[PDB]
Structure formats: C-alpha cells, structure tokens
Amino acid sequence: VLSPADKTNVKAAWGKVGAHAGEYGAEALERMFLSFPTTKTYFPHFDLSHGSAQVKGHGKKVADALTNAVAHVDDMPNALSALSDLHAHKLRVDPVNFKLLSHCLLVTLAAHLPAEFTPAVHASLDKFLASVSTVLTSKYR
Amino acid sequence: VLSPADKTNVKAAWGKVGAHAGEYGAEALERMFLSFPTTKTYFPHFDLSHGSAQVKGHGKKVADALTNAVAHVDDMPNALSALSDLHAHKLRVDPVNFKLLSHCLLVTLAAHLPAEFTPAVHASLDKFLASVSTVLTSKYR
Amino acid sequence: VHLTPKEKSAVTALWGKVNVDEVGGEALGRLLVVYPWTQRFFESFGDLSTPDAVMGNPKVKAHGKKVLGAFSDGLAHLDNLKGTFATLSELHCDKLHVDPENFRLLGNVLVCVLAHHFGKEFTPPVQAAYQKVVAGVANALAHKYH
Amino acid sequence: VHLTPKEKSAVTALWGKVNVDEVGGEALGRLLVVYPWTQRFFESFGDLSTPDAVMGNPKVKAHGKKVLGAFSDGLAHLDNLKGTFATLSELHCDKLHVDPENFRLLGNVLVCVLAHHFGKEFTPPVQAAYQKVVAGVANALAHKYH
Ligand code: HEM
Ligand code: HEM
Ligand code: HEM
Ligand code: HEM
Predict the structure, then answer these.
(1) Which domain holds residue B97?
(2) What CATH number does residue B14 fall under?
(3) Cα–Cα distance measured from residue A31 to residue A45, given in angstroms and rounded to the nearest whole number
(4) CA-angle at D82, arms to C143 and C67, nearest 5°
(5) Which Gene3D superfamilies does the entry link to (chains A, B)?
(6) Which chain C residue's Cα is nearest to D3?
(7) Distance between Cα A58 and ligand 1 center (Å)
(8) What b/e sequence results for D19-28 when a residue is b if at least 16 CB atoms lie within 10 Å of its CB, and e otherwise?
(9) Residues near D56 by Cβ (< 8 Å), separated by ≥ 6?
(10) A3: Cβ contacts below 8 Å, ≥ 6 apart
(11) Annotated binding residue at D1?
(12) Gap between the Cα atoms of B128 and B134, Å rounded
C-alpha cells in the first residue's frame, strides 16, 4: 500500500514538477503514442503529430487529474470516481494501457528531475501510478 | 468493484462447493503445478505428485482462506491481512502467479459445477478472485 | 509447440468430442462478458448490453465458430503455427491493433469452456496440454508485433 | 527486431555514451528496489534490506555490468537475438524459472535509467527505438518458454 514515506515522496516529487506539470503530461502521451502504437486507436479524432495542440491540451488534463490524486491521495477512489466511469464504461480502455502510460510518465519525470528521481522516489511513484491505475480500471474488477 | 450481484453470485457458487471445498483447492493447485511449471519453485519442500498428502493438505488451507474472504467479502483487506504479509514480505511471490492460480480455480469450478458456472457467475468469480489477488499482493503497491 | 505423444493424444481425443457450433460462441461470448473492454472490438455485433444479450447474439455465435476453426487449424499445424496464423496475425495486429494480452485471455476462457463442457474428463494433465496449445496460438497471433 | 536506419542511428549513438560501470548496476538495483519479489532471486547477494543497501551492494553493481554486456551483444545481433540469447534463455527459463514478465520489467527500468542519465537527449523517438530493442531482448530471453 502507499506508506507514509511513499506519500511524502510523491508529494515532494510532484511538488518539483511545479508549473511544468502540463508540459510533462503532453510529453508522456507523445512518448506513449510513439513507443506503443496500439494506444493510438483511442485517439482517432486526435492529430498525434509532434506540435499537436490536441495532445498539448490533453496532457494538461492528464496532469490535473494526477494533481488531484496527489492532493487527495488518501481518498483517490472518491476523487477520481468520475474518470474511472469514463475510461472503463464509456471508453473501454484496455487495462494493459494504464501500465504503458504509467511507464511513460516515469520516463518523463526521470528525464526532467535528475536530482529527485532516486530509486526510493522511483519506487514511490510507481506504486502511486499503480494506485491511480487501479482506480481508473476499478469499474472492471 | 464487487457489485451487490457479484457478491450474491460468489456466495451462491461457493455455497454449492460445500464440503468439497478442500478437494477443489487441492485440484486447483495440482492444475497450476502441471500447467505452469514455474510455480513449483515455491514449493521445494513439497512432493507435488498426484496423491501428495502435502498438496492435499495445502489445498484445504487455500480453500479455507477463500471461505474467509467470502464470509467477509466486504472487509477482505482486514480478513486476509496476515496472508498478504506472508505471500508478499516473506514469500516474495511474483504477482503474475496469482492470476495462474485464479485461472486454475475457475477451471476447477467449471469442471465441478456445470449448472452454476454461468457466464454471469463466471464473471463474478473472476472479479472476486481478482480482488483476493489484489489484497494478497497489496504489500507491493 | 511440442506435445508429448501422450499429450497430443489427450488433446486430439478431446477436440474430437467438441461441439463446434457451441464451444466457439460460448468462448467469445464469455470473453466479452468477463472482460468488458473487449466489447469495443465488436460494437457492430449489436447489443452486448447484458450477458444474456451477449450469449444470445447470433453474430457472437457465428464469429465464435470462425475462431474455433482457427484453433482446429492450429491443432493440425502445431509444427508451424507462425506460418499458419500469419494472415490472422496481420489482421489482429496491424489492422485491429488488439493487445496480445487479449489473445491469452481468450485462450484461457476457451480452456474454461472445455472444462465446463467436459467436466471430470478435463483432467489436470489434459488441461496442461491445452494450456501449451493456447499458449502457442497466442504467441503466433502476436508474432506480427515483434 | 527491425530498426529503421534513423532508429539504429539513434540507439547506437546513445549506447556509445553509456557508462558501462554505472548503468548496469543502476538498472538491476532499481529493479530489486521497485519490484521487491525479484529479490528472491538474489538472496545470495547479501543485504538487500534497504534501497541504499541494494544500490550500494557490490554484487548488484557487478552483476549489473554483466547484464548490460548482454544488451550490447543483443545490440550487435539484432538480426538474430534468439540465437544470441539461447544460452541465457536456457539459464533464466529452465534453470532459474524466472517469469518472462520480469524480463519486460527490467527492460523498462533500463529505459528509465537511460532517460535519467541522458535527460533531454532521450527524446520520445529515441525511447521508441529502445522500447523496440528491449522488447526484442525480452522475447528472445523467453523463447525457451514457448
Ligand atoms: C494515468 C491514467 C490516466 C489519467 C490520469 C487520465 C486522465 C484523463 C483525463 C483527465 C481525461 C479527460 C476527461 C475529460 O475531458 O473530462 C482523459 C480522457 C481520455 N483518456 Fe485518459 N487518462 C489516463 C489514462 C488513459 C489511457 C491509458 C488511455 C488510453 C490509452 C486513455 C484514454 C483517454 C481517452 C480516449 C480520453 C478521451 C479523450 C477525448 O475524447 O477528449 N486515458 N483521460
Ligand atoms: C488465491 C490466492 C492464494 C490464497 C488464497 C493462498 C492461501 C494460502 C494459505 C492459506 C497459505 C497457508 C498459510 C499458513 O500456513 O498459515 C498459503 C501458503 C503459501 N502459499 Fe499461498 N495462497 C494463494 C496463492 C499463492 C500463490 C499464487 C503462490 C505461489 C505460486 C502461493 C504460495 C504459497 C506458499 C509457498 C505458501 C507457504 C507453503 C508452506 O511452506 O507451507 N500462494 N497460501
Ligand atoms: C486466440 C486468439 C484469436 C483467434 C484465434 C481469433 C481468430 C479470428 C478469426 C478466425 C477471425 C475471422 C477473420 C476472417 O474473417 O478471416 C477473427 C476476426 C476478428 N477478431 Fe479474432 N481471434 C482471436 C482473438 C481476438 C481477440 C482477443 C479480439 C479482440 C478482443 C479479436 C478481435 C477480432 C475482430 C474485431 C475480428 C473481426 C474482423 C472482421 O472480420 O472484420 N480476436 N478472429
Ligand atoms: C533483460 C533480461 C535479462 C538479461 C539480459 C539478463 C542477463 C543475465 C546475465 C548476462 C547473467 C549472467 C549469466 C552468466 O554468468 O553467464 C544473468 C544471470 C542471472 N539472472 Fe539475469 N538477465 C535478465 C533478467 C533477469 C531477471 C528479470 C531476473 C530475475 C528477477 C534475472 C535473474 C538472474 C539470476 C538469478 C542470475 C544469476 C545466475 C548465476 O550466475 O548464478 N535475470 N542474467
């Protein structure tokens, strides 16, 4: 589970992200679309080129949802309640895909926060993203 | 999540298992050891032959833990608290393995309860075993 | 996949008693019921709103028959599944973009359906041999991904 | 794995700037730290009680160097990874019985380590090419399973 230390690590690392949250969100998406092509099937109405305003705008949305999760890390189920319904019921996103996005998010942070991405924080972030993923697919199991 | 209907399906199907719970538990283990050889590395001190009293005795233990989970399906985290520590901290069981055992359990029930294993109950059982699995590996994420 | 003489014997012997009009539809329907996200691939099949709607869907029953045909074919060419599913691989991989994990799930649901239909006959050793077969088919189907 | 000329260029160019004494130990250590169950495979390595104990473990640093060597080798024989890892596959599969999902996890942790070390240089396209490589290595290592 998310231990007191994990909670602290996540809050600190995310705190470092600061204003670049939206940018890193767009970057993780772009990394996912390129490394894992299957994920693109979910975004037909999206132009997934490099300067895409659609991907830029969506990254901001993903970032804000994670900020919400960090701010309410002890009641994520409630906080993310609406997003689960969206991804599960409406979008039918394959559970496997949350792991690909999670990995791409970790890769983006590693590329932007050398000092913070220690093995310890890395493990905390992984558990955190794993917890966000569990909630978003909870309308399955 | 486990809906009111899922809860009902699980309670009913498990109710059918009745006294054969221990037997089906041993059978699922045997099915797992045979279909997925990697799982055997966790049982060096076990004779995994067909009439093994060790596997017979252990199946009873697995069955009783699932009975506990069904009896306290709304507070599984607490009920199974001790087993998680065992499998996660002490045994270091690879998470992937819970899916193999889960599948083998579903296969064993399908082979023993034709009337009950309807698509609906099948889906309820899968979510249930998925929930038991999440708790047993919670000392990870 | 390499099956032992006693294993191929177990598999084929069982596969012969299989109800081709039943099994296939039951496996695909249970997949759509048990793993809901897979429904995003068969929206054109009509109403998959409920399990009874899914299991009673003729399009589901019909496609299932096709799927089961692919397995029989794989059964005949175990020494060359990759070549046997090359066209299907291209289809599911390059065209549909189905994640490979789902080929594994269908294989296991198929195993559950056989256990349900054969009961005691589907012993652990027999399941073991079938797990090897569906494992091979899933890899072959995914081969266009690697 | 088939890499485009521009992709092989990206990969190799980056792999040359790689710190062989560092990267390898960092990847294996982070795997043991981030995915604790993997520690059951290196109990003989000593104390892996804490991340600092894991990252400072000389046995971990040393084995890591070996692992990274395997990747370089795979880098040179992309046209034949299966043949290149045949012996390693037999080792991890038949002897150690490591689940294939863990080869995937190590590959991704390796990707994270490279991103951490190269920062901006590790652009999305470059990661895309590396994901293809680690995907190939993981399959090759698992080939003794299918
Ligand atoms: C870390 C997990 C994820 C988070 C935090 C997240 C968050 C979001 C948010 C906040 C939205 C916008 C909701 C709104 O407009 O009200 C959204 C939309 C969406 N997400 Fe995710 N998402 C996640 C993972 C995924 C994955 C793995 C996929 C699929 C590969 C996905 C596919 C979509 C799609 C298709 C939409 C709708 C886009 C549109 O039509 O505008 N999401 N997501
Ligand atoms: C549905 C999930 C599972 C349940 C309900 C379950 C339940 C149990 C129970 C009740 C025990 C005995 C605890 C005691 O003696 O106090 C146990 C022990 C153990 N389990 Fe599990 N288990 C599950 C899955 C697994 C899996 C997937 C593996 C590994 C492939 C595993 C490996 C073990 C081992 C090695 C022991 C200790 C055996 C011994 O030394 O006697 N378990 N499990
Ligand atoms: C063991 C794996 C599978 C086998 C052997 C299999 C086999 C088949 C076969 C024989 C067809 C007919 C293609 C034709 O008309 O030539 C087909 C079509 C299709 N399959 Fe699968 N399939 C498998 C898994 C899946 C999974 C898991 C999904 C998605 C969750 C899927 C989605 C599709 C779709 C959407 C079509 C319809 C294509 C069309 O005819 O327009 N299949 N499959
Ligand atoms: C990308 C995947 C991996 C590669 C390329 C790799 C490579 C290697 C190499 C080069 C060796 C040295 C073998 C020798 O002395 O000839 C080795 C040993 C070993 N590997 Fe891996 N490995 C991988 C994944 C893993 C994973 C994920 C685990 C377990 C969680 C693991 C467990 C072991 C163990 C226990 C040994 C020690 C064997 C011994 O020397 O006694 N490896 N591996």
Answers:
(1) 1-141
(2) 1.10.490.10
(3) 18
(4) 20
(5) Globins
(6) C146
(7) 8
(8) eeeebbbbbb
(9) none
(10) none
(11) yes
(12) 10
CA neighbor of C86 nearest in space, from C102, C105, C73: C73
Instruction: A7-12: list long-range contacts, CB under 8 Å, 24+ apart.
Output: A7/A73, A7/A74, A9/A120, A9/A121, A9/A124, A9/A125, A10/A70, A10/A73, A10/A124, A10/A125, A10/A128, A11/A70, A11/A73, A12/A116, A12/A121
Q: Which residues contact residue B16 at a Cβ distance below 8 angstroms, ignoring those fewer than 6 apart?
A: B113, B116
- Rounded to 5°, angle at Cα B128 from B123 and B131: 130
Q: How many helices (H) and strands (E) does chain A have?
A: 7, 0
CA distance A88 to A136: 7
Partner C contacted by B27 (CB < 8 A) = yes
- Between CA C26 and CA C22 the distance in angstroms is 6
CA-only gyration radius of chain A, Å? 14
CA distances from B131 to B3, B6, B125 (A): 12, 12, 10
Burial of residue B67, with CB atoms counted within 10 A of its CB: 0-12 exposed, 13-18 middle, 19 or more buried: middle
Which atom of ligand 1 is the closest one to the Cα of A101?
27
Token digits of residue B56: 């017979």
**Contact of A13 with A113, CB cutoff 8 Å:** yes
From atom 16 of ligand 1, which residue's Cα is the shortest distance away?
A83
DSSP annotation of B36: -
Number of domains in chain A: 1
Residue appearing with tokens 């590329």:
A111
First to last CA, chain D: 18
Q: Which of B127, B130, B141 sits opposite A131 (nearest CB)?
A: B141
Identity at D135, one-letter amino acid code? A
Q: Is the dihedral of CA D98, D103, D105, D111 positive or negative?
A: positive
Q: Say whether B112 counts as a known binding-site residue.
A: no
Distance (Å) from the alpha carbon of D13 to chain B's nearest alpha carbon: 36
In the block, tokens 């869907």 appear at: C57
Structure tokens at C71: 């397995």
Which domains occur in chain C, in start order?
1-146 (1.10.490.10)
Q: Give residue D93's identity as a one-letter amino acid code.
A: C
Q: Nearest-CA neighbor of D105 among A106, C107, A11?
A: A106
- The CA-atom distances, in angstroms, between C106 and each of C24, C79, C102, D100 are 11, 22, 6, 20
Method of structure determination: X-ray
> What resolution (Å)?
2.0
Residue pair D74/D11 in contact by the 8 Å Cβ criterion:
no
Q: How many CB atoms lie within 10 A of CB D72?
A: 12
Can you tell me the distance from the alpha carbon of B20 to that of D12, in angstroms, rounded to the nearest whole number? Answer: 60
Any idea what DSSP says for residue C94? I
* CA dihedral angle for residue C23, residue C29, residue C32, residue C34, rounded to 10 degrees: -70
